[PDB]
Copies of this chain bind each other. A is one copy, B any other.
Amino acid sequence: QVVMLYINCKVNGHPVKAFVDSGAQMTIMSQACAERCNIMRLVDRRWAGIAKGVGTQKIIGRVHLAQVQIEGDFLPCSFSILEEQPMDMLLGLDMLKRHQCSIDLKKNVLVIGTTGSQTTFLPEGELP
């Protein structure tokens, strides 16, 4: 009964619950979430089918740059779009390292290294 790591963020003003996965090489957004956040126009479909990790769904394309809002911070991020994914957004080591983040399980916060801004991990009742 260990609660997995989620944070609240926003893309293009739209609320997103992001799964925090230090063992994932690539950050991934679901197509459903890219559509909901109105960022399909950013999806470079020339990256269709490029994936670093094994899975069960096709990669649709690659967002080279979109701002992921965490608290007051707008973080420039790169990520690929999976046709389907259990969670809307998987925050992987690529972006965790890009922003020099700290996954602090004592305080139960994700720290954004750049700015020292912090956002709390979600309690079990707020998990998708």
Residues of A within 8 A of B (CB): 2, 4-5, 19-26, 90, 92-94, 96-97, 100-106, 113
- 17 A-B residue pairs with CB within 8 Å: A2-B25, A2-B92, A2-B97, A4-B23, A4-B93, A5-B22, A21-B21, A21-B22, A21-B23, A22-B103, A23-B24, A23-B90, A93-B105, A96-B103, A97-B105, A102-B105, A106-B113
Q: How far is the CA of A5 from the CA of B4 in the complex (A)?
A: 18
Contacts of A5 in B (CB 8 A): 22-23, 93
Q: Give the complex CA separation of A96 and B108 in angstroms.
A: 11
**Which one, B23, B26, B101, contacts A23 given CB within 8 A?**
B23
By Cβ-Cβ distance, the 6 closest A-B pairs, closest first, are A21-B23, A106-B113, A22-B22, A100-B106, A103-B103, A102-B104
- Assembled-state Cα–Cα distance A2/B95 (Å): 10
A102 contacts B100, C-beta separation under 8 Å: no
Please name all residues of chain B whose beta carbon is closer than 8 Å to the beta carbon of A103 when the two chains form the complex. Answer: 22, 96, 102-103, 105
